[PDB]
């Protein structure tokens, strides 16, 4: 499914680290004046037109580069663009709502109506451009047994290290909101997590913890986990809700590799129903992945 495509970096932009999807290079007309400046990165599939390439290179406002990627994942596309322009970080993903470019590459990764860029709130929670990690509570951080418990109390230390370095903490466990909330309360994690996934929740013990799963779209022509194999789109949307419109890389840590929708990194852990000292090794793996990303963009 190797597909050729073009990417352009604006040589003088107002909004940085933001990418816009176009069905073709000609879509720039839809931006016209004082809109292109808000998308310093432009991505669009390539139609093998040398005259189009000539036009693009003549467009001195843009630095062009061509790369190929499978037509099924933002991961390869984003890796290619980020290595091309040496940008470890990505801004909010924008699309031309007037002319939605239907690329199978996306299929529920993330997006935004282009015009909403200016409305974005730059202020965020963590200084710099933190990483993001999503944890599937069930048997990943706790014990699958009924009387759930932290499989390895080193979980607290690992989360504190994540926070100290700077990295958004997200939970997505495919259980009842009440189940996950009470699991947090029992294992005394609670405030560790920036985002929680399973009007948010009201029990007189919590104010707002589980953003209501209002977004429903079934599947994008893929037979898999009934609910979903996790949702980069939903998690990044909640990041933006939490004022996080930038991130360095995203890692999904869970007890089930099947979900693994599209994440810059993934970590699998045992479906262990009883406590065991292994989360230190899992934390070692996660920090190794983070360091690997840091190596990819060490220069």
């Amino acid at each position: 499914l190797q597909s050729k495509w073009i990417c352009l970096r604006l040589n003088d932009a107002i909004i940085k680290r933001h990418v816009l999807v176009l069905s073709e290079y000609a879509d720039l007309k839809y931006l016209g004046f004082e809109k292109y400046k808000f998308f310093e990165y432009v991505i669009f599939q390539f139609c093998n037109d040398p005259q189009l390439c000539k036009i693009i290179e003549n467009n001195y406002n843009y630095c062009m580069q061509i790369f190929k990627a499978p037509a099924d994942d933002m991961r390869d596309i984003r890796h290619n663009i980020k290595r091309a322009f040496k940008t470890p970080v990505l801004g909010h993903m924008c699309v031309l709502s007037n002319k939605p470019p239907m690329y199978s590459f996306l299929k529920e990764w993330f997006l935004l109506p282009h015009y909403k860029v200016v409305s974005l709130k730059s202020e965020s929670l963590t200084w710099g451009f933190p990483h993001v990690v999503v944890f599937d509570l069930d048997s990943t951080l706790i014990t699958e047994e009924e009387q759930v418990e932290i499989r390895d109390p080193f979980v607290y230390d690992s989360l504190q290290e994540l926070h100290e370095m700077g990295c958004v903490l997200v939970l997505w466990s495919y259980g009842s909101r009440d189940h996950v909330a009470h699991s947090m309360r029992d294992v005394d994690l609670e405030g560790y997590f920036d985002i929680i996934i399973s009007n948010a929740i009201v029990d007189y013990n919590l104010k707002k913890r589980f953003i209501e799963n209002k977004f429903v779209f079934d599947i994008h022509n893929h037979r898999s986990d009934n609910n979903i194999p996790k949702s980069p789109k939903i998690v990044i949307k909640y990041l933006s809700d939490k004022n996080v419109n930038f991130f360095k890389s995203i890692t999904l840590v869970d007890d089930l590799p099947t979900n693994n929708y599209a994440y810059d990194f993934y970590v699998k852990v045992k479906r262990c129903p009883t406590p065991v000292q292994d989360w230190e090794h899992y934390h070692n793996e996660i920090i190794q992945n983070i360091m690997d990303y840091e190596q990819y963009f060490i220069k």
Partner: protein, 203 residues
């Protein structure tokens, strides 16, 4: 955004009309040209070029256009019709184009509410501040005048097309009743009159 793209297209059409005006290469603004009665040839050339431009737009595939036309710039009230500053009569085979120069001058001289009205726009103080920290022309009034003249000649050209396609009888009947072109586009899309609506209400 999308609507902004159509706005850009409309402004591009206005810019093309500007290119036509520059091709005519008039020293004076159209307001002064119309104010100057002696510039009968300039007025006639302006009207003819605008009509040809509108014809090309309305029939993109058709580049031909009547290359000669009788012209008469009228000044007296009895030589003009309310609501039709431009007219297309026939003097027994001779095609006469009558112009209501006083009405054109009045419309152009009318003060426009450029500043007076406040309208929604791309307005983001954050963008303005970021720009501040990172740091021959046409006025809005002139653009308004120019749009007004273009739309006037668009109405005149539609009446002219009725005249040529149907005949003088139907041209007169259209002058009496304008209901023919409530549908308008049904070619027409390139005509600004098909881009907006205007209405009058008892009050």
């Amino acid at each position: 955004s999308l609507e902004s793209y159509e706005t850009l297209k409309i402004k591009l059409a206005l810019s093309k009309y500007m290119a036509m005006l520059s091709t005519l290469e008039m020293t004076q603004p159209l307001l002064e040209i119309f104010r100057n009665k002696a510039d009968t040839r300039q007025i006639a050339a302006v009207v003819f070029s605008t009509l040809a431009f509108i014809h090309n737009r309305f029939h993109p595939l058709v580049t031909n256009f009547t290359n000669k036309m009788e012209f008469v710039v009228t000044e007296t009230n009895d030589t003009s019709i309310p609501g039709e500053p431009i007219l297309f009569t026939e003097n027994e085979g001779v095609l006469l184009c009558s112009v209501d120069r006083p009405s054109i001058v009045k419309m152009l001289s009318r003060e426009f509410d450029t500043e007076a009205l406040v309208n929604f726009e791309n307005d983001n103080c954050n963008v303005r501040i970021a720009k501040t920290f990172g740091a021959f022309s046409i006025t809005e009034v002139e653009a308004t005048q120019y749009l007004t003249l273009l739309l006037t000649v668009e109405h005149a050209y539609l009446h002219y097309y009725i005249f040529k396609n149907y005949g003088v009888f139907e041209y007169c009947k259209s002058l009496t009743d304008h209901s023919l072109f409530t549908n308008k586009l049904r070619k027409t899309s390139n005509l600004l009159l098909s881009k907006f609506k205007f209405t009058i209400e008892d009050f």
